Design a protein around this ligand. Structure first.
Ligand SMILES: *[C@@H]1O[C@H](CO)[C@@H](O)[C@H](O)[C@H]1NC(C)=O
Ligand SMILES: *[C@@H]1O[C@H](CO)[C@@H](O)[C@H](O)[C@H]1NC(C)=O
Ligand SMILES: *[C@@H]1O[C@H](CO)[C@@H](O)[C@H](O)[C@H]1NC(C)=O
Ligand SMILES: *[C@@H]1O[C@H](CO)[C@@H](O)[C@H](O)[C@H]1NC(C)=O
Ligand SMILES: *[C@@H]1O[C@H](CO)[C@@H](O)[C@H](O)[C@H]1NC(C)=O
Lengths: 117, 117, 117, 117, 117
């Protein structure tokens, strides 16, 4: 008995494994005594945007593009009292193969073995 | 008895496994004594946008594009009292193969073995 | 007895497995004593948008596009009292193959083995 | 006895499995004593939009497009008292093959083995 | 009995494994006694943007681009009282193969061994 084996393998198989975890902990409070006197509370916030004849990517192609043109983002800016943000903003971006990618697996093997017994 | 095997494998099979978890913890409160006096509460917020003759991507193609033109985003900005945000904003973006991708697996093997016994 | 096997496999089979979980925890409150005096509560919010002759993607094709033209998004901005957001906004975007993708599996094998016993 | 087998397999079969779960936890309250005095409550909110001669995607095709033209979204902005949002907004978008995709499996094998015993 | 094996392997399979974890710790408070007197609270914030005839990437292609054009980002700037940010902003960007990448695996082996016994 004989064993002849030729597993020709042209394979592309990348892969990622991830463990993600958050615990807010222990928030314990005993005998918290409070006397609060705050009359006449008057907070102010003004947000303004104006734009005229803008343009973006006015030319030839981009293979991949995550970037922006003139924009405005506002987050958690003016918290006044007892404001909690716990594990608040979790942003995960995972890409195996990006945009505009060419995979051309051009496999044309020739294999002619023999066994004489 | 003989064994001849040639599992020619032209295969593309990438893959991701993920564990995601959040626990708000323990929020315990005993004998919290409070006396609050806050007459005449007058908070203010003004948000304004104006735009005229804008344009975006006025040209040739983009393989892939997540970016924006002039926009405005407002989040959790003016919390006044007892405001909690726990594991609030979770954004996951997972792509195996992006846009505008070409996979051309052109497999034309030739294989003629033999066994003489 | 002999064994000859050639499982020629031109296969594309990527795949993702995910575990997602949230627990709000333990929110326990004992002997919480409160005396609240808040007459004359007058909060204000104004949101304004105006747009004139805008345009977007006024050209050749996009393979894939998630981006926007001038828009406005407002979230959880002005919470006044006892406002809770727990595991509130969960956004998952999963794509195996994006838009404008070409898979051309052009498999034309030739295989003529033989066994002489 | 002999075994000859050639399972030529040109197959595309990607697939995703997902576990999704939320538990609001334990919300326990004992001996909560409250005396609330809030006469003359007058909250205000104004939301305004105007648009004139807008246009979107005024050109050649898009393979796939999830993006918008000038719009406005308002969510959970002005909660005044005892407002709870638990696992409130869950948005899942899962695509195996996007729009404008071409799968051309052009399989024309030739296979003529033989066994002489 | 003899063993002949030639597993010719032209394979590209990179992969990353990650452990991510946060614990807010222990936040314990006993006999916290407070007397607060803060009448006439008047905070102010003004945010302004104006833009005219801007442009971005007005030329030939970019293989990959994450960069922006003139934008403005505001975060956690003006917290007034009792403001907590715990494991607040977690941003992970993982790419195996970037955009505009060419993988051309052009495998054309020739292999004709033999065994005479
Ligand atoms: C971490 O992930 C591995 C697999 O990568 C798994 O065996 C283990 O259970 C995970 N541990 C935790 C604490 O999530
Ligand atoms: C982590 O994921 C692995 C598989 O990747 C699984 O065995 C395990 O149960 C998971 N553990 C937790 C704590 O989620
Ligand atoms: C995690 O997922 C694996 C499969 O990926 C499964 O065996 C296990 O039950 C899951 N565990 C939890 C805690 O969800
Ligand atoms: C997780 O999913 C696996 C299959 O993916 C299943 O065996 C298991 O029951 C699930 N566990 C939970 C806790 O949902
Ligand atoms: C760390 O990850 C390894 C696999 O990379 C796993 O065995 C282990 O459980 C993880 N440990 C923790 C504490 O997450």
């Amino acid at each position: 008995s004989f064993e002849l084996t030729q597993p020709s393998s042209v394979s592309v198989s990348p892969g990622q494994t991830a463990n993600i975890t958050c615990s807010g902990g222990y928030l314990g409070e005993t005998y918290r005594s409070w006397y609060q006197q705050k009359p006449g509370q008057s907070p102010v916030l003004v947000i303004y945007q104006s734009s005229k004849r803008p343009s973006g990517i006015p030319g030839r192609f981009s293979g991949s593009n995550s970037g922006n043109t003139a924009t405005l983002t506002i987050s958690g800016t003016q918290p006044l009292d007892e404001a909690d943000y716990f594990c608040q903003a979790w942003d995960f971006t995972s890409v195996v193969f990006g945009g505009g990618t060419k995979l051309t697996v051009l496999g044309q093997p020739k294999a002619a073995p023999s066994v004489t017994l």
